Paper text:
The similarity of eukaryotic actin to crenactin, a filament-forming protein from the crenarchaeon [name] supports the theory of a common origin of Crenarchaea and Eukaryotes. Attempts to trace back the origins of today's eukaryotic F-actin filaments led to the discovery of crenactin found in certain organisms of the order Thermoproteales within the phylum Crenarchaeota (Crenarchaea, part of the 'TACK' superphylum). Hence, it has been proposed that crenactin filaments share a common ancestor with F-actin. In [name], crenactin is encoded within the arcade cluster of genes, together with four arcadins, and has been proposed to be part of a cell-shape maintenance system.
[name] depolymerises crenactin filaments by binding its C-terminus into crenactin's hydrophobic groove, a mode of action related to eukaryotic actin modulators, widening the potential evolutionary links. Addition of a C-terminally truncated version of [name] had no effect, suggesting that the conserved C-terminal α-helix of [name] was responsible for the depolymerisation of crenactin filaments. Indeed, the peptide triggered depolymerisation of the filaments at a similar rate as full-length [name]. This effect was confirmed by analytical ultra centrifugation, showing that crenactin becomes monomeric upon addition of the C-terminal [name] peptide. Co-expression and subsequent purification of crenactin and [name] resulted in a tight 1:1 complex. The dissociation constant of this complex was very low with a Kd of 31 ± 4 nM (n = 4), as measured by SPR (Surface Plasmon Resonance). To gain a better understanding of this interaction, how it triggers depolymerisation and how this might be related to F-actin depolymerisation, we solved the crystal structure of crenactin in complex with [name] C-terminal peptide. The structure was solved to 1.6 Å by X-ray crystallography providing detailed insights into crenactin, binding to ATP and, more importantly, showing how [name] induced depolymerisation of the filaments. The [name] peptide was located in the hydrophobic groove on crenactin, a cavity formed between subdomains IA and IIA. In the filament, this hydrophobic groove is occupied by the D-loop of the following subunit in a strand, forming one half of the longitudinal contact. The nanomolar interaction between [name] peptide and the hydrophobic pocket is likely due to a tryptophan and other hydrophobic residues, making strong contacts as shown in Figure 3—figure supplement 2E.
Numbering used by the authors:
A (entry chain A): 4 to 430
B (entry chain B): 188 to 203
The structure:
Amino acid sequence: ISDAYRLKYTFGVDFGTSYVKYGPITLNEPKMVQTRGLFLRDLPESVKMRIPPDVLARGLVVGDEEVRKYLSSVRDVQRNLKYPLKDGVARRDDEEAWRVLKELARYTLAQFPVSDPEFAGWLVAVALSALAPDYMYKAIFDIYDELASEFKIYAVTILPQPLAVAIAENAVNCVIVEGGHGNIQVAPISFALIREGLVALNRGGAEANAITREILKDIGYSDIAREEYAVEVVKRAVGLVPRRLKEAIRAAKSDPDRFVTKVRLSPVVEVEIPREYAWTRFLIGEIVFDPNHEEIKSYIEQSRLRIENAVIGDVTLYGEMDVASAIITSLRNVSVEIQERVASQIILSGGAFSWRVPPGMEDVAADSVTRVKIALEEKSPALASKVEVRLVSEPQYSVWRGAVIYGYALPLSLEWSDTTREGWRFP
Amino acid sequence: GGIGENEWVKILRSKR
Ligand SMILES: Nc1ncnc2c1ncn2[C@@H]1O[C@H](COP(=O)(O)OP(=O)(O)O)[C@@H](O)[C@H]1O
């Protein structure tokens, strides 16, 4: 296995809570597919008549185009659409979850054929949540060992998602904040992931969608709000992050016309945010950073929104803790020697931090870097005066880039150890 | 963001 070989045939797979990012090291950007599968059950004979036999026999479809093909036909898709990693962990005995993960592992390899004889298998590098227990590592290794009989696979390794971000950013000493649909992971990196400093929050992009849905109902779009794809489009289009929420709300109630907006959902369907509710745009961006505001609590009191802790194995995911407090807690839980190395660089990653400021709104609205700096200046002025905060260039692709760098560089002489939790396995 | 300048490459290649 030469150096040139590894620059062609390293293959990265990032298993996100809502999207899998995947493909060879030679791609300029990864491909993406939703982390879900559709079971084909209870279908009318009218519909089943025109489905290929091999697909009907399999009874489970993955791939965005393919799931879209059959979604209209399934009447009850809450029961039949399975999301195996919606909180980052597939439970040990959840057989449907692990079947969907194996099908996704198969589909992603199947998108990249062979046409060069000096190829003898991929070198696969998989990224999983820092929340993943030991049994998840074993089950993922098992999936790729089984698929090695269907595809040429030379070697396989696994690493945690926050470490991959640090590698992609060329940052050996830092604090990573990685936020997707399901949760936020906060972890210090000093030549390795410092486990004792991991802090997890039970909020993500799903919470921004949840409050968008409730705003839409209040405006009068309850029927639209029942469609998850539509809530997602509205969230991305109209969400705003305040510099400081109370100041942003006062501005939008004094001059609501600055903040009214419209969203086209289809050639026929359009949504309008009117004057009375224009200020609520700031709730959609704020909720991931800090949910402790009366205007958010109002929906909780109505039993229309949940903000709560969760427990997965040995880790508690905190519902209410704000992002700044999580950074400060993470540092407190590691030694002073490590703190002095990593506290200089805070790095935000993941799609939940993608927010942009519309032209003209710089007085009241913020991007994620600014919102986090404001929070740190309030809760720890000393830290704030010495730290640099940044957002990765491609928020959804950073983990995958670090996975392919890791797979390229990790020595092939380093065999997997259950004790150190690093190394290669060879099918 | 190039591989040649990435300090992690030397760190990872040193592992035994
Ligand atoms: N432009 C955007 N504005 C706001 N949120 C976004 C944007 N793009 C993506 N997102 C959100 O990012 C999340 C996806 O993050 P991602 O990094 O793929 O991790 P995961 O697969 O764990 O969800 C989703 O909740 C999605 O709605």
